[PDB]
Amino acid sequence: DVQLVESGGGLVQPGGSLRLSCVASGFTFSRVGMGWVRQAPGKGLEWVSDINASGGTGYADSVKGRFAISRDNAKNTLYLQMNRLKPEDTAVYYCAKMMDTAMIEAGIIKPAGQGTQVTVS
């Protein structure tokens, strides 16, 4: 099977915390740069965070210092630790290969997975 499968969303209060996961299947995970994007109501898809195969990371300006991306290669799993959550973070979050993120933002392709919903209210 070839899939990206997100879980871990939920409904938290402002200031709260969630950890999202994505389990990847169908390819050698450790050598691929992975990331997260999100889609807020009425908006397009937008980058959240990247982690390259070497463990270098990047974050959208609006989440820096609050979110932390990590990966467990032995479990084919990507994580996004969300702390200090804000109402503006409400969105469906999706996992992607890093090389797919710009095409997803542009609407050229869609996320592979069904995503997971985060509501901050």
Author numbering: 2 to 122
Could you share sentences copied from the article?
Nucleocytoplasmic transport proceeds through NE-embedded nuclear pore complexes. With a molecular mass of around 120 MDa and an outer diameter of ~120 nm in higher eukaryotes, NPCs are among the cells’ largest protein complexes. Nanobodies (Nbs) are the isolated variable domains of heavy chain-only IgGs. Using a selection strategy against conserved epitopes, we obtained anti-Nup93, Nup98, and Nup155 nanobodies that block Nup–Nup interfaces and arrest NPC assembly.
To map the functional epitope of xhNup93-Nb4i, we solved its structure in complex with the α-solenoid domain of xNup93 (residues 168–820) and xNup93-Nb2t by X-ray crystallography and cryo-EM. The tracking nanobody xNup93-Nb2t binds to a C-terminal region of the Xenopus Nup93 α-solenoid, it is frog-specific and did not inhibit NPC assembly. The presented approach relies on a high species specificity of the used tracking nanobodies, which can indeed be explained by the corresponding nanobody-target structures. Similarly, our newly solved cryo-EM structure shows that xNup93-Nb2t fits well into a pocket at the C-terminus of Xenopus Nup93, but clashes with the backbone of human Nup93 at the same protein region.
